[PDB]
Symmetry: C3
Subunit: 492 residues, 3 copies
């Protein structure tokens, strides 16, 4: 049966209703704030985490960006479930009323944790998320739409007992110190929601691996230590290692036990393989101070760039290289905006603050980032190329924008922060942290983790190390083009 | 080569053309009435019944609801094929000319049977379907569009030698007696089309189970007899029974014959399991007079309901419960209609007759039924919640509408009619019969069967028993709200 | 790193850029002509040929037929790869700038070959394609859009060292001799692009079968020699042969080697089966002068046709039969064009030249070809039926259009040309060659090959033999309707 609980929370009460709706779900709540309401259920099934968010139109008046809010719920949820879970986990979040003030998206993130705790599914939570804006000089928790439209900051922080799990931000060239303060200010309200989820819990009363390891470990060390090897080559080399192991398992007959224990898991080969590769890259990074391609922990990959790659029809052309990550940006100017597709939100969030006001430049601006090769932050290459293409097209942008992605190896007390991560530094690492911006401050953020979280102290260090990467990449794209062209394209 | 046959049929001749089109199909006919023509083919392939209906736009003038007509053909076809058929059966129906009088949908249903008989595929037919309308006090077979738009009744009856297989109706608060008479009047024209399909046939010249049964039967009795068990629990209990049987089959080695006879059918476990559960629920119902949750054969599940579940932005809110079936209806009012989605046709067919005339209420009315839990007629919960939400929104409806679904166990001479069926009463039963309406009469019908049909006499009894369910559910939703609110929403 | 190469080519230089873009691709080039640029990559992966073409909108000005250009690249590529290739082959072609003169489609075809050679994937190339138009009396290689819109011819020729692999044409009732000359003129520029791809290559420095054969061969001869057997029957007969072979392989236990060599390839049964059937149909055709249904190598299947199959609402009705290939065409006339769908491009390419000028006939013309049975050229049946339906609707077309598909068996020095091919003559043959047109000349072409190519000399013979088929089919559709009706439909 139904139970309300109110939580006093920065002026806007957050109300939870359990026992009201979806009685066949593992756990459920109507989480409500003001007059915004979203229903969040969670169900473990025999079988793996599907999160569907719906924004109903009757919630505001029905007449004849949801996938982003789908990922916003999923990202901080995923790495809190134990890794050995193989049952199906269905999370549904339907927004059923929009108050013209309260945005529902952070409400659904918090409800997802609440609903998983009521379904008493093992996970290392609870988690919560808040939004932080900035009006004048005042940070504000869960601002309305009005402050989002008027203010200088729009960031989401999700955390848990073990720290911050997700950040997602737009900002108007905010300095690192204020971004760090906003993150910290918002993680403290996350903790206030962690408590009172813990209060709700109290209230309502809630063989083969060794085989592979021994055969393959000393082989993986050496590929990981071969710094002259490019990413394609090291991928073809680690594949051959795994292939010979498969051949050895195939050679022995059905009589051996591990062949049956391996035909009982047609994938364990890959999982243990990656886990051995993860371990040896990590020890390579923590004790030795070198990454898998020989670079220092602060070193940025070699950067290349050019302008006007395409004919002057394409109003703006820009090619960017970071190692084997390649992006070609194309700029179109039109008539009666500002948008950008990625074959996207992160880079238009990162470009917008420097786009000139309608008064000066009345074209509608259209940027397409063709990702032609991927090895790290293709979304940061998309930002960098976008700026180049806008400068080739004569768009009088305030400042050029650049960005890089940081990584993290966290081996106990040992913590290392990587700049401009290789793909497998992202796959076998603990953090994917994109930061974009200008000479003056930050414009866009995006953090994903595969562990239960990080302290704010380590986030501050990654944000400081990433300004150096952004500075180095930007101060070397200006050797391709230092100003926007004074004139536009004859076909613009 | 081509052959015509005309059938004299209530004023409108029905013409069939065989040997004309689709010469690689098992069987085919252009069935035509007036100047409406639809081509219906049927092909058995080695491999399971796919029915695709297409309504071409050149049929009426091509310029730059078909899935419902797809189901209308499929539903009365499916349960006439023997259950042991595993070959692929492709039925295609293309409407190739619309006469502005004759609706083609019932033509395609009849052709589907004709085409299956020519392909000489085993099935317990023939079947046919007709439409019945009512103009003034005159029932009429296969009315035009004009009578459908003007009249008081729009029902489809499909039958076969063994009785009626499908009904689908809209009506304007018609009393049960007239609905029963229309069904009977239309089944008699169905029989007139059964004959003359039989005339066409004459013219053209057309080990493991016992193992599972013995291990599991006395176990299934007891779960089925445990009335205090909720539906989730009894589902988790019957699963454990099947799981232990799987474990026992896995325990014995490849040496036993049934393990190979079971690895020859990776599903027979479930089929025999369900067949044992079907048998014991049925004997539970016929000899004992009790259902699986302890209810009498006329008993309706406990009903709950409330109004204004959502904030007053949502112009109308209504939550309905029947056992573990839960529906939340939401009402939106707008400006320059009447429609309803289901996450739909049956409930707008059932609400429409009480919607006020434009003169009084000029808003466009929009209802969304969120099905939050399913255990029986979620479409009838959708009707009930819709009425509640319309009453919360101040829509001055003529009368409130409610509905329930009836079921049938037919064990030979023994026939039992269930009210407000549980899911497995629908899965392991012989009939799913939805009836909706008001204090005065019926508004909407929908019948599906998994057997070859029922006599009209049993249909009359299910329709009478269902008025009692509708009455009980309605007379207990008025204890939540007895009148529409005199005023609308401040945000309407 | 990046390398340009220019190729002097009929006035319009073709420039190639390698080492510039997509550095993780097997091979890549920006191929450019004038200011049209398309990027073409090619990658072999462990696993089968996927070709994706994209036409970006920024290439011309981006604002808020590609599948045909996808097939145009794929068709001449496919049969140049060795048949024993099982690795994945990804070909991507992005058009990144449209010059208002140069059409990019033939550029991507040529780049696909260039990119495969740089990825040094085994294939029997290189290939190239060009477009040929006709302005006045001047053939022109790779015309602009202006000549395409104004001229009389629009054909694509793709070839390789072994001959022509693909043709695709629209034309205004061009005589066979000029079509043959255009093909030959364009294949010579294809050879000029073959060379200078060879110059680039030089520059940059680039048991079970016998079992099945012995069991089944003398059985397949006899089904193939049974001329009174219809296509369905011979398909059911060859299936039984393969089924008994499967039974024999199943009868023997795991002890035999071929059962394990056959459970190592769960498809080799079909492949060897088809390969035996291919061989014996081919020897049936080359030494004996008879096809599998008893027809001569120039014989057209029996043709049937009728007009007004549907009610006079359907402004035009036409049913065409060639053997078991059946098409029903339907004609709609409207108001403020000329298009045709196929349930399409080839038949509107083939009808357009005889459609009357706006001055005389101002309706918008809409033709739908329902393919009701397939055994050969359903697209040529679509042309023939379209003409019939246009004549039933009173459209005053200049001349009626008809067409047929030719085939080829090429057994070494032995070369046989088939008219109006059966399905398996297309599956087990070397060529599918559709030609459509009128009394005066040709209107539409489409050639596919599964071998590395044919000499122009054999193409000239197939084009001459196909005029006879078109003539015979047309001069026998006029015995159904010899003129368009002087008046239109009462419902037109
Ligand atoms: Mg990532
Ligand atoms: Mg049902
Ligand atoms: Mg073909």
């Amino acid at each position: 049966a139904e139970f309300e609980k109110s939580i006093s929370f920065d002026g806007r009460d957050i109300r939870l209703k359990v026992g009201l709706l979806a009685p066949q779900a593992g756990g459920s709540v109507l989480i409500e704030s003001g007059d915004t309401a979203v229903l969040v259920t969670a169900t473990r099934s025999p079988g793996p985490l599907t999160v569907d968010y719906e924004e109903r139109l009757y919630a505001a008046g029905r007449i004849p960006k949801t996938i982003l809010t789908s990922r916003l719920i999923d990202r901080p949820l995923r790495p809190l479930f134990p890794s050995w879970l193989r049952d199906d986990l269905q999370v549904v979040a339907l927004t059923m009323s929009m108050d013209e003030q309260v945005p529902p998206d952070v409400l659904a993130v918090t409800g997802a944790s609440i609903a998983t705790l009521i379904a008493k599914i093992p996970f290392n939570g609870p988690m919560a998320a808040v939004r932080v804006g900035l009006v004048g000089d005042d940070f504000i928790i869960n601002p309305t739409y009005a402050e989002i439209e008027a203010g200088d900051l729009d960031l989401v922080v999700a955390g848990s007992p073990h720290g911050v799990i997700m950040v997602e931000a737009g900002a108007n060239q905010l300095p690192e110190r204020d971004i760090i303060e906003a993150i910290d200010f918002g993680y403290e309200a996350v903790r206030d929601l962690i408590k009172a989820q813990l209060d709700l819990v109290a209230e309502l009363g809630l063989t083969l691996e060794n085989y592979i390891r021994d055969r393959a470990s000393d082989e993986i060390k050496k590929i990981l230590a071969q710094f002259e090897l490019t990413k394609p080559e090291r991928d073809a080399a680690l594949d051959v290692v795994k292939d010979n192991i498969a051949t050895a398992i195939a050679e022995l007959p059905e009589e051996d036990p591990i062949r049956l224990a391996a035909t009982a898991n047609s994938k364990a080969l890959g999982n243990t393989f990656k886990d051995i590769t993860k371990y040896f890259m990590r020890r390579q990074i923590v004790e030795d101070n070198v990454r898998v391609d020989g670079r220092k922990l602060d070193q940025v990959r070699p950067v290349s760039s050019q302008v006007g790659v395409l004919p002057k029809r394409v109003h703006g052309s820009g090619l960017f290289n970071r190692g084997l990550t390649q992006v070609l940006s194309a700029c179109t100017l039109g008539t009666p905006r500002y948008l950008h597709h990625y074959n996207g939100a992160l880079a238009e969030r990162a470009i917008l603050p420097v786009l000139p006001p309608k008064e000066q430049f009345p074209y509608v601006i259209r940027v397409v980032s063709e990702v032609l090769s991927s090895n790290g932050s293709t979304s940061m290459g998309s930002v960098c190329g976008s700026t180049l293409a806008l400068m080739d097209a004569g768009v009088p942008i305030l400042k050029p924008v650049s960005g890089a992605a940081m990584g993290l190896i966290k081996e106990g007390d040992e913590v290392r922060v990587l700049t401009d991560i290789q793909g497998i530094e992202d796959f076998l690492g603990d953090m994917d942290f994109k930061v974009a911006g200008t000479d003056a401050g930050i414009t866009a953020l995006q953090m994903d983790m595969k562990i239960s979280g990080l302290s704010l102290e380590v986030i501050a260090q990654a944000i400081h190390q990433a300004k150096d990467a952004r500075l180095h990449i930007l101060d070397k794209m200006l050797q391709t083009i230092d100003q926007p062209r004074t004139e536009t394209s004859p076909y613009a």
